[PDB]
Amino acid sequence: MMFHKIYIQKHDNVSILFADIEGFTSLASQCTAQELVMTLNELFARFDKLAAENHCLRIKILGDCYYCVSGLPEARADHAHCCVEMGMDMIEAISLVREMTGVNVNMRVGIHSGRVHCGVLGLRKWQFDVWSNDVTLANHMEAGGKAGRIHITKATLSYLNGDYEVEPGCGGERNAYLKEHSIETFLIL
Amino acid sequence: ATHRLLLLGAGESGKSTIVKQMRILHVGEKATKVQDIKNNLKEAIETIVAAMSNLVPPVELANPENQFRVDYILSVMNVPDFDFPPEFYEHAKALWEDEGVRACYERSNEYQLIDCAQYFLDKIDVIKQDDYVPSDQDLLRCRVLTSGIFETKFQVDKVNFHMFDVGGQRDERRKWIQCFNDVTAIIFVVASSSYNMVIREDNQTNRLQEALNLFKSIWNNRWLRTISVILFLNKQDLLAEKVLAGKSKIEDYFPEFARYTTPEDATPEPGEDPRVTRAKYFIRDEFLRISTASGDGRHYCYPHFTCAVDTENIRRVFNDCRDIIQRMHL
Amino acid sequence: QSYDCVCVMFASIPDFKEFYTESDVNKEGLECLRLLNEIIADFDDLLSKPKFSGVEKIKTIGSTYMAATGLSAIRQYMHIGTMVEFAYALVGKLDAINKHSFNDFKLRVGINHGPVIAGVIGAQKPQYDIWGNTVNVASRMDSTGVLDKIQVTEETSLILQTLGYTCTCRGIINVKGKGDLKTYFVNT
Numbered sequence: 146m147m148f149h150k151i152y153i154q155k156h157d158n159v160s161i162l163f164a165d166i167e168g169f170t171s172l173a174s175q176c177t178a179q180e181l182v183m184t185l186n187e188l189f190a191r192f193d194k195l196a197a198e199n200h201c202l203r204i205k206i207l208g209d210c211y212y213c214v215s216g217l218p219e220a221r222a223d224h225a226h227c228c229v230e231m232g233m234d235m236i237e238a239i240s241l242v243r244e245m246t247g248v249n250v251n252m253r254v255g256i257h258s259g260r261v262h263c264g265v266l267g268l269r270k271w272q273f274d275v276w277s278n279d280v281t282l283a284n285h286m287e288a289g290g291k292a293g294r295i296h297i298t299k300a301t302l303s304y305l306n307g308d309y310e311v312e313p314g315c316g317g318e319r320n321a322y323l324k325e326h327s328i329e330t331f332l333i334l
Numbered sequence: 335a336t337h338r339l340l341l342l343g344a345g346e347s348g349k350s351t352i353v354k355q356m357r358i359l360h361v362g363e364k365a366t367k368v369q370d371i372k373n374n375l376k377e378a379i380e381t382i383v384a385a386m387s388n389l390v391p392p393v394e395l396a397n398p399e400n401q402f403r404v405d406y407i408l409s410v411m412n413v414p415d416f417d418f419p420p421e422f423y424e425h426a427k428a429l430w431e432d433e434g435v436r437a438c439y440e441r442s443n444e445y446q447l448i449d450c451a452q453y454f455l456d457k458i459d460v461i462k463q464d465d466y467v468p469s470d471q472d473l474l475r476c477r478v479l480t481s482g483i484f485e486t487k488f489q490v491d492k493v494n495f496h497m498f499d500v501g502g503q504r505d506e507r508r509k510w511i512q513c514f515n516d517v518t519a520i521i522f523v524v525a526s527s528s529y530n531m532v533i534r535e536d537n538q539t540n541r542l543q544e545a546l547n548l549f550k551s552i553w554n555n556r557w558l559r560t561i562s563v564i565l566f567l568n569k570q571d572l573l574a575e576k577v578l579a580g581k582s583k584i585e586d587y588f589p590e591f592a593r594y595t596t597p598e599d600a601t602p603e604p605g606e607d608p609r610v611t612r613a614k615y616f617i618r619d620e621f622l623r624i625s626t627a628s629g630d631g632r633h634y635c636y637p638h639f640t641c642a643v644d645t646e647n648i649r650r651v652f653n654d655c656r657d658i659i660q661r662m663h664l
Numbered sequence: 665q666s667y668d669c670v671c672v673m674f675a676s677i678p679d680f681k682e683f684y685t686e687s688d689v690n691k692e693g694l695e696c697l698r699l700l701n702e703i704i705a706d707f708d709d710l711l712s713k714p715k716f717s718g719v720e721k722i723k724t725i726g727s728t729y730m731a732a733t734g735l736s737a738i739r740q741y742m743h744i745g746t747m748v749e750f751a752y753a754l755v756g757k758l759d760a761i762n763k764h765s766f767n768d769f770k771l772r773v774g775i776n777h778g779p780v781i782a783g784v785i786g787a788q789k790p791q792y793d794i795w796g797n798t799v800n801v802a803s804r805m806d807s808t809g810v811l812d813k814i815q816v817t818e819e820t821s822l823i824l825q826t827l828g829y830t831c832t833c834r835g836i837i838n839v840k841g842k843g844d845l846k847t848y849f850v851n852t
């Protein structure tokens with residue numbers, strides 16, 4: 146009654162995936178706004194599909210930034226692999242062999258694991274979102290991927306139960322924020 | 335049954351001291367805070383000596399000899415991690431023993447200084463020892479700035495309490511609302527005595543009038559329009575001395591005290607001079623004219639004359655404070 | 665569908681990335697969202713006013729409000745001045761919230777106009793977002809702005825003056841892809 150309801154709910158052990166069309170704006174100065182909004186939509190259509198299959202949930206979309214968390218809403222201890230295969234699928238999701246999208250695009254997956262705080266802010270035009278430093282981190286993990294090799298924070302490897310094959314991403318050199326907190330970054334193979 | 339209390343107040347009103355009273359009354363390591371004590375004593379003196387030349391007119395010593403003891407403390411003021419040598423205790427103490435240093439101290443309001451001054455300096459002897467172990471009062475007088483918010487989980491009569499001390503500074507008020515949500519009642523804190531000193535945050539605003547305007551902010555806050563504040567007119571002892579002594583009238587700082595008469599409902603404690611009686615209540619009604627305006631019966635204000643460094647008084651009050659949480663069914 | 669004149673406005677709070685603390689006191693970052701909700705929500709209380717009856721709230725990027733006026737139609741460029749009245753709107757509120765949080769937030773803005781290709785997207789829960797370069801800049805004119813000021817482009821600079829608004833040239837700022845462009849600030 147004092148503070149508006151704030152429909153937010155903590156949620157402690159999930160994996161968060163972030164993707165960005167590497168070099169997109171380059172694609173822009175070449176194609177019609179329409180074919181772009183289309184290529185974009187096209188891509189995201191197949192994304193929400195590859196999304197619900199690996200048991201993950203898509204949060205929101207920002208232009209070319211499509212970020213889908215995992216382990217929600219109902220808790221799934223499987224959060225690790227989820228985002229992992231999400232990126233997996235996401236990589237082949239840019240099969241330009243059938244997507245005549247123009248100048249070479251690629252995702253820049255940036256996964257991470259930690260605790261969250263999801264819900265919706267405001268009272269109008271609600272949009273489901275995720276909030277937490279960990280969530281801030283997974284964003285920079287996205288802002289630190291190479292040619293779309295999947296980034297995975299050391300916390301993401303501790304839930305992978307060492308199943309996948311990762312290599313030192315030397316993150317931090319790639320992105321300031323990773324270095325700032327000295328986070329050991331890897332890369333799935 | 336769990337209750338959460340937030341303490342608010344101007345700068346150095348005496349919040350943390352209360353939260354310390356709390357541990358003391360409801361909760362060996364006294365050898366790790368000895369340091370901070372000496373660091374107080376340090377500032378205590380170096381601050382007084384410092385402001386002797388700066389003041390206008392100047393405050394010169396009576397024993398010119400001490401010019402060299404002045405150069406000593408002034409040669410250690412910015413020194414990092416002082417090792418505390420007997421020389422310090424010495425020259426400092428002789429400086430305290432000096433009449434012009436006290437003279438500078440009787441006007442310690444024209445310059446920012448801590449409250450534990452009078453106290454610590456009067457026991458350089460007791461502090462200097464190698465076996466000096468801070469007693470209980472010594473640990474409630476040791477001043478330290480609170481940076482952020484800390485939760486003290488204590489229990490009383492099989493009923494839990496959660497104390498929340500917060501940065502009393504201005505640069506700290508940006509963290510209060512981080513606890514404004516679902517908290518029993520607000521213990522406000524004031525320095526009934528600080529009615530003669532400008533704040534540290536700027537050196538131009540009356541501490542008291544800043545405590546009034548602060549109370550105003552919380553009392554009328556859009557998230558505290560339902561939460562009852564239990565104002566704490568603290569440092570009642572200091573207020574008195576300043577009052578009684580008269581070396582600083584109250585009506586020259588708050589002219590609205592000239593037309594002021596003494597209250598009816600007043601319950602004048604046991605031979606508390608009529609000069610004090612009137613004063614302390616005056617300082618009550620300044621906070622009351624605020625709680626009288628808005629509120630609109632959604633929340634009321636329960637004042638409490640107090641002395642945070644009196645584990646005796648503080649208990650009498652945190653009991654009334656334990657009462658109203660049960661009585662008003664808060 | 666695609667429009668020919670859609671005034672896009674971003675209103676971010678850099679000052680929040682810091683205020684957001686994840687501590688055991690603030691229920692781990694909650695109690696500050698709880699305050700950010702109290703803002704965004706308090707910021708939405710505008711869309712339901714007479715003056716901003718035509719103001720549309722596109723979305724919300726974390727601690728960044730995204731509105732747009734001019735999506736209810738086929739002067740012709742007046743809602744630009746309306747969008748600004750709304751920039752001035754959020755500020756009135758944003759600063760007022762401070763008065764009760766003892767905080768000090770400042771609003772940073774990036775208004776612009778042109779063709780935006782509004783529509784929905786997604787296979788699950790579709791969302792209504794306005795794509796287009798007009799918006800590309802609208803954001804880049806925010807991400808590089810100044811607090812308490814509104815950063816408008818050349819043309820926007822112009823139009824705003826014919827409405828009674830003075831504009832000062834911040835200088836040049838590289839709006840990536842579109843290259844180095846000249847921006848101005850709306851004299852408050």
Ligand SMILES: CNc1ccccc1C(=O)O[C@H]1[C@@H](O)[C@H](n2cnc3c(N)ncnc32)O[C@@H]1COP(=O)(O)OP(=O)(O)OP(=O)(O)O
Binds near residue numbers: 174177795803
């Ligand atoms: C001329 N550009 C376009 C023509 C029609 C459809 C889209 C574009 C386009 O590239 O739009 C940009 C924003 O307007 C559009 N956008 C929409 N909503 C947005 C938003 N809320 N915040 C930021 N950008 C947003 O996304 C795009 C991302 O730019 P960003 O700077 O985020 O790119 P990047 O993510 O780092 O990609 P790259 O690696 O290639 O540099």
Ligand SMILES: C=C[C@@]1(C)CC(=O)[C@]2(O)[C@@]3(C)[C@@H](O)CCC(C)(C)[C@@H]3[C@H](O)[C@H](OC(=O)CCCCN3CCN(C)CC3)[C@@]2(C)O1
Binds near residue numbers: 274276282726
């Ligand atoms: C609400 C508090 C706080 C501090 C915590 C948080 O998790 C965020 O909500 C994220 C991180 C988080 O939700 C990931 C999505 C997104 C949208 C990216 C948010 C913004 O970056 C927020 O800040 C901002 O508004 C500033 C940065 C926005 C710039 N980013 C750069 C990367 N691209 C891909 C998207 C835009 C955020 C940081 O703010």
Ligand SMILES: Nc1nc2c(ncn2[C@@H]2O[C@H](COP(=O)(O)OP(=O)(O)OP(O)(O)=S)[C@@H](O)[C@H]2O)c(=O)[nH]1
Binds near residue numbers: 344448475502568
């Ligand atoms: N003489 C006297 N001193 C008191 C009294 N109550 C508190 N103090 C003194 O006030 C000084 C400042 O106390 P403190 O608790 O630090 O204030 P604060 O409100 O907590 O301010 P901060 O520390 O967050 S910035 C301490 O040295 C303490 O002993 C009192 O009733 N009388």
Ligand SMILES: [Cl-]
Binds near residue numbers: 345347544
């Ligand atoms: Cl005060």
Ligand SMILES: [Mn+2]
Binds near residue numbers: 165
């Ligand atoms: Mn991209």
Ligand SMILES: [Mn+2]
Binds near residue numbers: 208209
């Ligand atoms: Mn982007």
Ligand SMILES: [Mn+2]
Binds near residue numbers: 350478479499502
């Ligand atoms: Mn304190």
